[PDB]
RNA sequence: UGAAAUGCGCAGAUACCGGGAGGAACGCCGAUGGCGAAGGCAGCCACCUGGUCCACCCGUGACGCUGAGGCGCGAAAGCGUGGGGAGCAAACCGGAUUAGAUACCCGGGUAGUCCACGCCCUAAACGAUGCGCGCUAGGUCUCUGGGUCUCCUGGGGGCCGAAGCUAACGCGUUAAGCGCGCCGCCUGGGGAGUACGGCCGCAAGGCUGAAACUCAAAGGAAUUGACGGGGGCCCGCACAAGCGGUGGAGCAU
């Protein structure tokens, strides 16, 4: 993409809730494009929250994203010399989809033999700022709370 | 006395910046110095030395060992020519030490000596 | 500059008042006045500035460095700020 | 320092303050400027001295231009005697990079760079364009004297350009134009600025300077294009962001 900057393109609505970021999420949890598989699963596992969890599904989920959202991040550069890590603010148009991506991968990456389970539970492992989703934000924004050396640039 | 806490109040803090580290001093009011570090004295040792960060950091640590001794405000004194100018000194506006002045006194020879190799030319 | 240049400068015309007025340029003690003709430190200004032409400069300055020996002018004066 | 290491620091360096010794160069002014026969020449001051431009038309009265040979001057380096030696730096000592580095990079370091007198005399000593003189549109900027002074007249430096010139690039009243005087010099490349002879030098070397042989070229400017670890602009899932996969296995081809 040289020119241009490609135009953003919005999903519909969720028909469950009918709010962006769900099918966003839904989305990600989804294999080879099935959707339905793909949608039970995070229904299912927007069940599980109501039980294990009296707050209501969905502000689990959104609350649970916004503990995961990046705000800084390492676009490296080359200052000449070496690669520099050069930290960023996160445009937030990135930080929801590393966000729903991380936590459908530390999903997966958890133990329990199922699909909703992994999904719920991190979700709301996230609602408390804990889980191995989280964890990478941290892991994250920490290679960032410094930068590295851009004296040359004297501005 | 022992090591004696000595309170100053007021003093120096003459920066030293160029291609290859940065030095930050604090002294009296009358130049004798009181505490000084740099990029060294914080683990960074190569080139890391000449990092901008070496400007602040090492211009924290003048101020927060040098604020040990009372001086609540200083006199800045700028030196060299390189990267790390005015980031030492925004690291003392933030570091706790008021700032009185700031200036520029960078040693330039009338013409007197010649470079080495390494320096001749320029346009 | 940018797309200013900063190099407009219209032959000036009328020089405001050509800096001061009626005053000796081979004056090796009047500094009152040399003190005008050098920048922060004891830079002499270039033409640019001041407001001379050809053989005044050529005088301006072989003044201002007959003063500096005389320990009544600066060659180097530190800098404020920046 | 690209990263480093040698190197210097607790006999306390670096960094800051004060004081002292020494050598060398001399900021800003400074310039697209000036002066000089060239080399070359910039802190300031005084002194001794050269050249030069202008205004006045006052004096001499062709007394002029050139200039083989001669003589003198001649960057840097180098050489001799003696002093000085801060910084820098051949050679050389180590450090590092490399396939290897007696190199580019890094840390030291001698001659040297400095001054005196003596010697060397070469140079991209280039404007690569001998000196003088007369003639041939302008414009523009600039240094310096005269001027009825932002206009005209003289000297010097640049720019653009008439005619003209030139192989072209370009030059063009700072001619590479038009002319005259005189001087030097060229007469294909390589071998050679070498060999020999001679002159010169303390030496290093320098000036003068061939041929046998050999090759059909060596060469100059400009055109098209290609190429560049040249530059500006700009596209393509080319990179990045992202999703899935290949490289692992069994099999198929
Ligand atoms: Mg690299
Ligand atoms: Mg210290
Ligand atoms: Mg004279
Ligand atoms: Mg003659
Ligand atoms: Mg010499
Ligand atoms: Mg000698
Ligand atoms: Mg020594
Ligand atoms: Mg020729
Ligand atoms: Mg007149
Ligand atoms: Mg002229
Ligand atoms: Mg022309
Ligand atoms: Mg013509
Ligand atoms: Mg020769
Ligand atoms: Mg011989
Ligand atoms: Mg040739
Ligand atoms: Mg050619
Ligand atoms: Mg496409
Ligand atoms: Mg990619
Ligand atoms: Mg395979």
Same mark, same amino acid.
């Given at each position: ?14 028909? #469950?809730?009918?709010?962006?970021? #769900? ?9 080879? %494009? ?33 503990? #995961? ?62 889980? %191995? ?23 | ?31 004798? +110095? ?80 010649? +470079? ?8 | ?13 009328? &020089? ?45 300055? &072989? ?20």
């Amino acid at each position: 993409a040289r020119r241009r900057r490609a135009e953003v393109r919005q999903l519909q609505p969720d028909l #469950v809730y009918g709010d962006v970021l #769900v099918t966003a999420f839904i989305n990600k949890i989804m294999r080879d %494009g099935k959707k339905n598989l793909a949608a039970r699963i995070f229904y299912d596992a927007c069940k599980i929250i109501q039980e294990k969890t009296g707050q209501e599904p969905l502000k689990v989920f959104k609350q649970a994203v916004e503990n #995961v959202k990046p705000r800084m991040e390492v676009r490296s550069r080359r200052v000449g010399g070496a690669n520099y890590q050069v930290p960023m603010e996160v445009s937030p148009r990135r930080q929801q989809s590393l966000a729903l991506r991380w936590l459908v991968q530390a999903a997966n990456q958890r133990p329990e033999r199922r699909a909703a389970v992994r999904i719920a539970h991190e979700l709301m492992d996230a609602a408390e700022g804990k889980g %191995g989703a989280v964890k990478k934000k941290e892991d994250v924004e920490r290679m960032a709370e410094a930068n590295r050396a851009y004296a040359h640039y004297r501005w | 006395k022992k090591k004696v806490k000595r309170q100053v109040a007021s003093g120096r803090a003459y920066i030293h910046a160029s291609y290859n580290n940065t030095i930050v001093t604090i002294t009296d009011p009358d130049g004798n +110095p009181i505490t000084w570090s740099s990029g060294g004295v914080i683990g960074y040792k190569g080139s890391r030395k000449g990092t901008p960060y070496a400007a602040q950091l090492a211009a924290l640590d003048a101020a927060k060992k040098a604020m040990a001794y009372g001086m609540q405000s200083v006199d800045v004194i700028v030196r060299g020519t390189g990267a790390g100018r005015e980031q030492a000194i925004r690291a003392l506006q933030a570091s706790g030490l008021q700032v009185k002045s700031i200036v520029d006194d960078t040693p330039v020879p009338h013409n007197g000596c010649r +470079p080495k190799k390494k320096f001749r030319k320029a346009s | 500059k940018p797309k200013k240049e900063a190099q407009r400068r219209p032959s000036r015309k009328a &020089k405001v008042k050509a800096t001061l007025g009626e005053f000796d340029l081979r004056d090796y003690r009047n500094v009152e006045v040399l003190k005008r003709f050098l920048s922060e430190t004891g830079k002499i200004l270039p033409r640019r500035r001041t407001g001379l032409s050809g053989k005044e400069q050529r005088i301006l300055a &072989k003044t201002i460095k007959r003063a500096r020996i005389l320990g009544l002018l600066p060659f180097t004066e530190k800098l404020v700020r920046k």
